[PDB]
Design a protein around this ligand. Structure first.
Ligand SMILES: [Ca+2]
Ligand SMILES: [Ca+2]
Lengths: 526, 195
């Protein structure tokens, strides 16, 4: 998920701006639900996740808000020491303790005939048992810092909906117990950013990248004050951008640091904001378009590739050509002429170059753990370690010397070019790859079916599942948004689809939007 | 535009805009319009949290239902959560559930017109809702963004590296794979911006 908030000094109109882009996948019916809520002193328009009695992406009379996932450290795993004579007992604070046991019955549809299966589940003082290592007399239990406070988080979000100023919104933020980033913009020109959640006070004797021994010496000691959560009102830079990246330089997240490295996809939003002076909502939309189509490895890896090839272009004419094509490429995989092929043929070379390079960097050392490390070293948010190795920047382990790294870059180039020459030809326009498409399907990230989906294909975009663009003018929030696939999920018994089942797909695919409605006079004619 | 005590204006995209005299009425209407538009989705999201999807979609979802029940909460535990909220807030969540239930009751009485195709095809009926079920709808999606077992993956990475390469090399490699803090990682705010 991505977000931007723009303060008065960075906004062309001198009004604070907000951009939302939650990434919750693409399903029909959609993951989001758009609504307008109007009662005395409470006027709010926007969307929330399906089933939520509150808006997360939108604006009330006073403030606009959005959120992105925090990735903060709110789950710890405890390694329980099991009694070798009784695997339902674990050692805790000097004594064997008994696990709480629960039997659960599952009715399963077969064929039609229904069957009953039973399973037994265990809890310790730390939480549910998630994994057994019986060989080691260990069980693993899971502690959430928000355990039992999920309803308090709902209440906090409702209070954010009802809030009228920074003080009230910050109060709501301080009560939210799960790990999100919250973003705020108001009609007085203020912007604010909060990394919300209840973050536990951990033992300073343990390495928080690994499970914590569960014997009692290393327990959490409460939760830190909200005043220690990363947060800023009216930061000096004049804006905040985020694409699930790190809140602030010294904020840590334990086992999940793999998302917060030097190479990070938020660079697309930083680049776009820093390349401009004062901005309007149209500028924000252009930044979203760039991020949505960017080949994210280009930011740091395309210059490294060019630098290597340039050293050898006097001997290798194919390298001179590649350099020219790479330099003129705008780093996007886009289809501006809607012909079904990505516009830059060299992007197909670059994709294959990267895949070859990643494998040559790590297969010889991490191949034996690649079922777990490939998701780190080729992560969708960035490839920091690969960047450091190829650039010669300091690492703890000496993966490759600069000479070995350069040979990898060259071998990967030769292999990628040889395959393109064999299958498509020598001109880059022949390399253009067919676009990847996506549908709004039947199964969301909760991993169970919730409808019948849609078969309408649109180009894949690394983009929010909805977008709002809001300007907090003195009169009212104004702007535009899109909430695909459509508002209404109802399909009649006879197969008739609601006219609002997928009537926002074209807007979404074509970078068009519908007006943000706030004034009732506008609503009645919308 | 159509009127209980709440005026509902559906715009040209079908988005409902609710005009109420108080929050109790507003939140009931909010649940009602969401159920009108999304009842089968709401039902299945709830079943996801309760671990009852395999009642509808079969054995392919048994392990998913097991995980959901393993890590989830009983109705009583959720009710205790609701009882710890501000009185008014709990009441509004109850109103929201009453609105969903109002549509359920309408749909089961006129199923051929008001129950969506998936219920007819899968051969079951929607049940009525309580405020605890609203909390379940929050948990099924929000917890996904918070819950992970990366600590266990990390322990496995380190152990496998150590058994082939030895401890000193494995530690260096692991520190490059899952760092303590990359001081060059781009950040949303600067340290001097902190309140
Ligand atoms: Ca942790
Ligand atoms: Ca094209």
């Amino acid at each position: 998920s991505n977000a931007m908030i723009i303060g008065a000094k960075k906004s062309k109109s001198a009004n604070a701006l907000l951009f939302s882009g939650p990434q919750v996948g693409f399903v029909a019916p959609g993951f989001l639900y758009e609504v307008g809520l109007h009662s005395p002193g409470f006027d709010m328009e926007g969307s929330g996740f399906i089933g939520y009695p509150f808006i997360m992406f939108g604006a009330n009379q006073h403030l606009a808000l959005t959120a992105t996932a925090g990735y903060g450290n709110v789950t710890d795993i405890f390694e329980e020491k099991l009694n070798p004579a009784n695997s339902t007992q674990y050692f805790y604070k000097g004594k064997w303790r008994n696990m709480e046991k629960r039997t659960e019955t599952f009715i399963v549809r077969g064929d039609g005939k229904s069957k009953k299966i039973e399973e037994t589940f265990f809890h310790t003082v730390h939480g549910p048992v998630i994994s057994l290592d019986a060989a080691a007399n260990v069980a693993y239990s899971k502690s959430w810092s928000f355990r039992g406070t999920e309803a308090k988080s709902i209440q906090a979000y409702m209070k954010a909906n009802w809030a009228k100023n920074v003080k009230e919104f910050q109060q709501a933020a301080s009560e939210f117990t799960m790990s999100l980033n919250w973003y705020y913009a108001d009609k007085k020109g203020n912007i604010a950013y909060y990394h919300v959640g209840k973050y536990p006070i951990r033992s300073n004797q343990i390495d928080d990248r690994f499970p914590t021994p569960g014997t009692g010496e290393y327990e959490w000691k409460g939760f830190q004050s909200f005043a220690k959560n990363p947060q800023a009102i009216n930061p000096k830079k004049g804006y905040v951008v985020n694409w699930n990246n790190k809140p602030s330089k010294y904020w840590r997240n334990g086992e999940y640091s793999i998302v917060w490295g030097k190479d990070n996809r938020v660079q697309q939003f930083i680049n776009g904001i820093e390349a401009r002076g004062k901005v309007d909502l149209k500028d924000l939309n252009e930044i979203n378009y760039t991020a949505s189509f960017a080949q994210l490895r280009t930011h740091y890896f395309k210059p490294l590739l060019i630098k290597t090839l340039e050293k050898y272009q006097s001997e290798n004419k194919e390298y001179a050509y590649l350099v020219e094509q790479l330099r003129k490429w705008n780093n996007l995989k886009e289809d501006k002429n809607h012909d079904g092929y990505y516009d830059a043929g060299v992007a197909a070379f670059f994709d294959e170059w990267w895949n070859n390079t990643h494998d040559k960097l790590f297969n010889d050392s991490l191949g034996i753990v690649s079922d777990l490390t490939r998701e780190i070293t080729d992560h969708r948010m960035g490839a920091t370690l690969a960047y450091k190795v190829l650039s010669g920047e300091p690492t703890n382990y000496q993966w490759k010397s600069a000479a070995a790294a350069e040979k990898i870059i060259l071998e990967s180039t030769d292999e990628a070019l040889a395959k393109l020459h064999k299958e498509k030809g020598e001109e880059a326009d022949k390399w253009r790859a067919p676009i990847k498409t996506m549908t709004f399907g039947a199964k969301s990230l909760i991993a169970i079916p919730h409808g019948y989906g849609s078969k309408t294909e649109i180009i894949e975009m690394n983009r929010g599942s909805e977008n709002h663009y809001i300007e907090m003018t003195p009169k009212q929030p104004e702007g535009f948004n899109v909430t695909p696939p459509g508002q209404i999920g109802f399909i009649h018994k006879d197969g008739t689809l609601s006219e609002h089942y997928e009537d926002q797909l074209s807007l979404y695919a074509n970078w068009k939007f519908k007006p943000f409605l706030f004034d009732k006079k506008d609503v009645k004619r919308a | 535009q159509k009127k209980e005590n709440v005026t509902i204006i559906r715009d040209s995209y079908g988005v409902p805009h609710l005009y109420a005299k108080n929050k109790k009425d507003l939140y009931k209407a909010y649940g009602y319009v969401m159920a009108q538009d999304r009842l089968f989705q709401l039902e299945m999201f709830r079943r996801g949290n309760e671990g009852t999807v395999s009642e509808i979609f079969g054995e392919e979802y048994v392990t998913k239902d097991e995980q959901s029940r393993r890590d989830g909460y009983s109705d009583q535990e959720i009710q205790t959560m609701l009882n710890g909220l501000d009185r008014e807030t709990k009441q509004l969540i109850e109103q929201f559930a009453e609105g969903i239930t109002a549509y359920v009751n309408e749909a089961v009485k006129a199923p051929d017109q008001k129950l969506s195709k998936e219920f007819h095809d899968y051969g079951f009926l929607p049940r009525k809702w309580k405020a605890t079920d609203v909390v379940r709808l929050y948990m099924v999606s929000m917890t996904y963004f918070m819950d992970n077992h990366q600590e266990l993956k990390n322990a496995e990475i380190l152990a496998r590296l150590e058994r082939v390469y030895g401890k000193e090399k494995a530690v260096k490699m692991f520190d490059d794979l899952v760092w303590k803090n990359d001081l060059e990682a781009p950040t949303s705010i600067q340290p001097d911006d902190q309140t």
